[PDB]
Amino acid sequence: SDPSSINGGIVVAMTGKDCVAIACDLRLGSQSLGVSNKFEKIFHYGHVFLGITGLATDVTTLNEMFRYKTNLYKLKEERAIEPETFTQLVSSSLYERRFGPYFVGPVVAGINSKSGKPFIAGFDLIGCIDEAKDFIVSGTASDQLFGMCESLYEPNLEPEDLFETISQALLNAADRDALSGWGAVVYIIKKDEVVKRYLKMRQD
Amino acid sequence: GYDRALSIFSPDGHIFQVEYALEAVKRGTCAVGVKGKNCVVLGCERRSTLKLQDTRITPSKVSKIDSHVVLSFSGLNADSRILIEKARVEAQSHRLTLEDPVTVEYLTRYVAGVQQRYTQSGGVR
């Protein structure tokens, strides 16, 4: 019944030293039933990454919507959109449905191409921005992720170290949530290279 | 909205805008239709003033309205697209509501009705 927990899923983002990381599980379900183990929740528009949890139809819809809006932004501005600017666009777009909202928990992650500053942000379903320095969590195991991130995280981690921290935060949170799991992906993002890693986890 | 009466009668009982529309048809490339015992053939002229044309992608003169009906024309090319689109929509609408494809006579009657409507509606030619 609760739209935010029908399909299940989780997303987590972290900052490091001159880098950011964003990760998600791959499960799509119909409550107790597992339907897909390939439902990726992270999308990118140029160098800006967006993770979305919640109702799967709205996840798919918002991706198509922000792809639409960022493609137009680029044609007019003659440049790729930045994370700070994209974050405001996501907030604007969600609040325009204030009284008929998308049931989602978006997470933005990226590095400003000009200043080189790492950036992450989270939102509620109606657009409120949570701009954090350390980490952002979202999903059915958000309580679990808050506990893992708040204890495992330390600032100024190197990319290959950050990878292990975020991966363990996701994996162990997902294994305490019935509606999350069935695979996982981690994006490691630097100013001009992005690596994507699929994790091996329990398939139950 | 623009409501101006463009198609109107003249003292001698003529609607000039409709008659001037026939002059546009006279200017258009020749189209011919011949029906045999068990077939119909539609022939169309292509003016050779336009070479360096890409014949793969250039709009063909004969248009399929449905799988069993075709429509060719003479006159303004841009105008023909509007009639063809309407005819195609109606063809699917007929299949959808009556569970039979349109008869050729029905489709013709629809297209002809659209043309007539544009001879006594305000703001349109």
Partner: protein
Amino acid sequence: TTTLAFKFRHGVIVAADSRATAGAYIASQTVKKVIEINPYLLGTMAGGAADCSFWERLLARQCRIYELRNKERISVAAASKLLANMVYQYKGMGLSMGTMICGWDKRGPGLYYVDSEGNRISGATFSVGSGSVYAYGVLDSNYKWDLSVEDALYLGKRSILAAAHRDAYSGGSVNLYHVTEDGWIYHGNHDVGELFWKVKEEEGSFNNVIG
């Protein structure tokens, strides 16, 4: 939960997962859903953990006083019926139990399904729990009477795995039991995480999953 049990030539197989849930939160993953009532009687648990635990432990004490007064081990049918009558008193009051009483007695291997609704059914094959529906597919397709102990143990194990994979509220580990006329035999605790990958490679199944 997912639990199953089935009769066959060489006794009865009993298998169950180990997950315990409180909403979406996985509270435990080390729960014993098979209770040892006597060296020849097993009981499965599904639904209310507290309910199933209390009433089946209380039944085991009824079955023991029976043995003392009568100099005879209780039958599977009598044991299943004592439970059924016990829970019937509290019918409509809120109890949530889905159990199977597995054993070997004078009539050979016995297997009864008992629930809080009032049902008490004898049968050769059962599966109860949220993941039962997934397990039935594997059982029904591969179940014989002329099944070897080795193949029968694998079937019950593979059936739980099928459910543990699909059902969100099933998983953790697989507990196996084999009941003979000389009594039940524990056949270990098997982590689904490790078991899944093993089965995938050796069997070739779960091709859709990457590993």
